[PDB]
Curated annotation (Swiss-Prot), chain A:
Name recorded for this polypeptide: Transcription termination/antitermination protein NusG
Source organism (scientific name): Escherichia coli (strain K12)
Name of the encoding gene: nusG
UniProt domain KOW: residue ranges: 103-134
Pfam families xrefs: KOW, NusG
Keyword Zinc-finger attributed: no
Free-text note regarding domains: The N-terminal domain interacts with RNAP and the C-terminal domain binds either to Rho or to RpsJ (NusE). These domains are separated by a flexible linker.
From Swiss-Prot, chain B:
Quaternary organization: The RNAP catalytic core consists of 2 alpha, 1 beta, 1 beta' and 1 omega subunit. When a sigma factor is associated with the core the holoenzyme is formed, which can initiate transcription. The rRNA transcription and antitermination complex (rrnTAC) consists of RNAP, NusA, NusB, NusE (rpsJ), NusG, SubB, ribosomal protein S4, DNA and precursor rRNA; S4 is more flexible than other subunits.
Biotech use, per record: Co-administration of salinamide and rifampicin or salinamide and myxopyronin suppresses the emergence of resistance to both antibiotics.
Name of the featured protein: DNA-directed RNA polymerase subunit beta'
Post-translational modification: Acetylated on several lysine residues in the presence of glucose.
Function: DNA-dependent RNA polymerase (RNAP) catalyzes the transcription of DNA into RNA using the four ribonucleoside triphosphates as substrates.
Phylogenetic classification of the source organism: Bacteria, Pseudomonadati, Pseudomonadota, Gammaproteobacteria, Enterobacterales
Family under the similarity heading: Belongs to the RNA polymerase beta' chain family.
Signal peptide: none
Entry superkingdom: Bacteria
Curated annotation (Swiss-Prot), chain C:
Protein name from the UniProt record: Small ribosomal subunit protein uS10
GO CC list: cytoplasm; cytosol; cytosolic small ribosomal subunit; small ribosomal subunit; transcription elongation factor complex
Reported function: Involved in the binding of tRNA to the ribosomes. Part of the processive rRNA transcription and antitermination complex (rrnTAC). The complex forms an RNA-chaperone ring around the RNA exit tunnel of RNA polymerase (RNAP). It supports rapid transcription and antitermination of rRNA operons, cotranscriptional rRNA folding, and annealing of distal rRNA regions to allow correct ribosome biogenesis. In complex with NusB is involved in the regulation of ribosomal RNA (rRNA) biosynthesis by transcriptional antitermination.
The family this protein is said to belong to: Belongs to the universal ribosomal protein uS10 family.
Quaternary structure and partners: Part of the 30S ribosomal subunit. Can also form a heterodimer with the transcription antitermination protein NusB. Binding of S10 to NusB is mutually exclusive with its incorporation into the ribosome. The rRNA transcription and antitermination complex (rrnTAC) consists of RNAP, NusA, NusB, NusE (this protein), NusG, SubB, ribosomal protein S4, DNA and precursor rRNA; S4 is more flexible than other subunits.
UniProt keyword annotation of Cytoplasm present: no
GO function terms (MF aspect): structural constituent of ribosome; transcription antitermination factor activity, RNA binding; tRNA binding
SUPFAM superfamilies listed in its UniProt record: Ribosomal protein S10
Organism encoding this protein: Escherichia coli (strain K12)
Swiss-Prot/TrEMBL GO biological process terms: cytoplasmic translation; regulation of DNA-templated transcription elongation; ribosome biogenesis; transcription antitermination
Keywords from the UniProt entry: Ribonucleoprotein, Ribosomal protein, Ribosome biogenesis, RNA-binding, Transcription, Transcription antitermination, Transcription regulation
Length: 154, 50, 98
DNA sequence: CATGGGTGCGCCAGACAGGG
DNA sequence: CCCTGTCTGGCGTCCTCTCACCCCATG
């Protein structure tokens, strides 16, 4: 059974640390003592012998493990939470809000000179794919037609 | 203030404050993300030392 | 295809408003079909003035109305840009139908 | 382009262990 | 607990006049 551990690298050379770590594994052929390497912190599926500990700290541009002590360094705590966040990440970020504003509903403009402005859709045109919303420019409402993607639903 | 050439010769306190603010932003983001215990212990320890 | 309708009452204040928006568009976009007006609009109302009698005192007042349409020819990303939150005419209703 | 981590001084003095 | 050895800190003259040089590095 291989448990997880946290490695600190020089932040910025992290992919090169991961590649050099895989290569040191396949050099010193302790292939049965390493499972994966996940990407300033590098996650390593590993077991704990002092030989494998010296192996990971002899990988270049690696400071050391992060744990309770340096004798017996520490596996993890909320590893499941980290895995869940990694699975989402881009998926969670993706939103793409389009103007679903109907009669009276407020919308947001992010394209053309009217970008960075909000307003309400007094009239909507699904057939012409156009929303009739006015922007409060210099006080007076500026009824302009914007596409669903041109504006966001507020 | 810059020197003759134009590159800004920056003071040391700006390095210190900029380090503390970089680390504090990292620590707020990790407490947002619910990182595990050893990550936020190293993060708060680096803030303490900063 | 882009319409700039302007809606107010008098032609003696909108007359500087049709000058400010064709020339400031000329410096930035220089793409306009020229101001094409609309028929002047009249709202006349006869009203009784004596406080409790006498259905003869009817004085004619009117809230007059005027409309002028600018109609820039091309959707310019410079005319709208410079003239977005900008309108010289005060107490006016601008309708920048894009 | 922007960020990210040596080995030659000597005395005083008081606090911290370390016997005693 | 009463003395003894160690371990770290705190400190060491004042004015001036030039010079030289101030973060890589890189996918």
């Amino acid at each position: 059974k291989k448990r997880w551990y946290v490695v600190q690298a020089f932040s910025g050379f992290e992919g090169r640390v991961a590649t050099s770590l895989r290569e040191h594994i396949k050099l010193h052929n302790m292939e049965d003592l390493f499972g994966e390497v996940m990407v300033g912190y590098v996650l390593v599926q590993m077991v704990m012998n002092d030989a494998s500990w010296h192996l990971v700290r002899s990988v270049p541009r690696v400071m050391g493990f992060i744990g309770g002590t340096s004798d017996r360094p520490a596996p993890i705590s909320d590893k499941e939470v980290d895995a869940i966040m990694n699975r989402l990440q881009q998926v969670g970020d993706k939103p793409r809000p389009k103007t679903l504003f109907e009669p009276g509903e407020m919308v947001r403009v992010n394209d053309g000179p009217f970008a960075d402005f909000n307003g309400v859709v007094e009239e909507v045109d699904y057939e012409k794919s156009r929303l009739k919303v006015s922007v409060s420019i210099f006080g007076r409402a500026t009824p302009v037609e914007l596409d669903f993607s041109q504006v966001e639903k507020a | 203030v810059p020197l003759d050439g134009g590159r800004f010769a920056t003071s040391d306190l700006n390095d210190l404050y900029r380090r503390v603010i970089n680390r504090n932003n990292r620590l707020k983001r990790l407490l947002d993300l619910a990182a595990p215990d050893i990550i936020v212990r190293n993060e708060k320890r680096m803030l303490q030392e900063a | 295809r882009i319409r700039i309708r302007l809606k107010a009452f008098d032609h003696r204040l909108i007359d500087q408003a049709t000058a400010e928006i064709v020339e400031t568009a000329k410096r930035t976009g220089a793409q306009v079909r020229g101001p094409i007006p609309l028929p002047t609009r009249k709202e006349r109302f006869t009203v009784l003035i004596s406080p409790h009698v006498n259905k003869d005192a009817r004085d004619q007042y009117e809230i007059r109305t005027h409309l002028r349409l600018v109609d820039i020819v091309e959707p310019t990303e410079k005319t709208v840009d410079a003239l977005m939150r900008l309108d010289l005419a005060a107490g006016v209703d601008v309708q920048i139908s894009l």
